[PDB]
């Protein structure tokens, strides 16, 4: 099991990760492990061979990310020296970003959507700062239908609901949903899914968070 301090890193920082070596009974065991770090193009850039011997099955490690590095979904692969076929992996994203001041949550009234539901799809927009306090601003929400590994945005389903008292409310009319696809019958949408794309912006215009609820 590979544990990384963060899920996303900035070009220049160091990736702190540890490896746990346990047997089929989940117990500390001293073994030899091969550790590789592949770039977003799946090509190993660093390979080692540590041993959890006399280390209580805990291998503290780190990898420095160069300033000039390829952004994308990196990967940390590892496996026992005696079992090169059984390889475990843990991914971490490398990208230029900045930590927002608040979070944006999008939870629909129901964890699904009934076809013949005239009421439509009601989605709740809860946004509060990282320290608990609520957010005062405006939201930009848009819907869309997701086919088999395909997304068909719905420009008609665009709304601008004010976020007062750290919360908002948006409803996707059943009319627009059917207008999106060029298929008259509604029983054809059975099986597909919907995705919500909200965006909260403070009244000071200093921060802007983008959330999403797909599936």
């Amino acid at each position: 099991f590979i544990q990384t301090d963060k899920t996303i890193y900035t070009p220049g920082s160091t990736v702190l990760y540890r490896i746990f070596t346990v047997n089929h009974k989940l117990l500390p065991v001293g073994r030899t492990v091969m550790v590789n770090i592949e770039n977003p193009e799946g090509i190993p850039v660093k390979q080692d061979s540590l041993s959890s011997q006399n280390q209580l099955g805990v291998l503290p490690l780190s990898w420095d990310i160069p300033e000039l590095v390829n952004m994308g979904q990196w990967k940390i692969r590892a496996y026992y020296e005696n079992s090169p076929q059984q390889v475990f992996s843990t991914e971490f994203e490398v990208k230029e970003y900045v930590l927002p001041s608040f979070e944006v949550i999008v939870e629909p009234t129901e964890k699904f959507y009934y076809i013949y539901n005239e009421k439509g799809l009601e989605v709740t927009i809860t946004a509060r700062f990282l320290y608990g306090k609520k957010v005062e601003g405006t939201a930009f929400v848009i819907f869309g239908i997701q086919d088999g590994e395909q997304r068909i945005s719905l420009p008609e389903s665009l709304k601008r609901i004010p976020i007062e008292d750290g919360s908002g409310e948006v409803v996707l009319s059943r009319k627009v949903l059917l207008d999106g696809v060029q298929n008259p019958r509604a029983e054809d949408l059975v099986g597909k899914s919907l995705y919500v794309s909200a965006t909260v912006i403070l009244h000071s215009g200093s921060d802007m968070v983008q959330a999403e609820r797909s599936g």
């Binding site: 301090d5 963060k6 920082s13 702190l16 805990v58 503290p60 930590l99």
Partner: protein
Amino acid sequence: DEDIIAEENIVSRSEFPESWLWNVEDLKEPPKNGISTKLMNIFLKD
């Protein structure tokens, strides 16, 4: 016609790490009911 604190005596914050407290601890305290307890004294960031 003046008050507040001098802009010279204001220790501004600086430590804003995205991650910290990456250390190791061992529970060797006198076990009671099979449960060991350790009281750590850490320093929160800014």
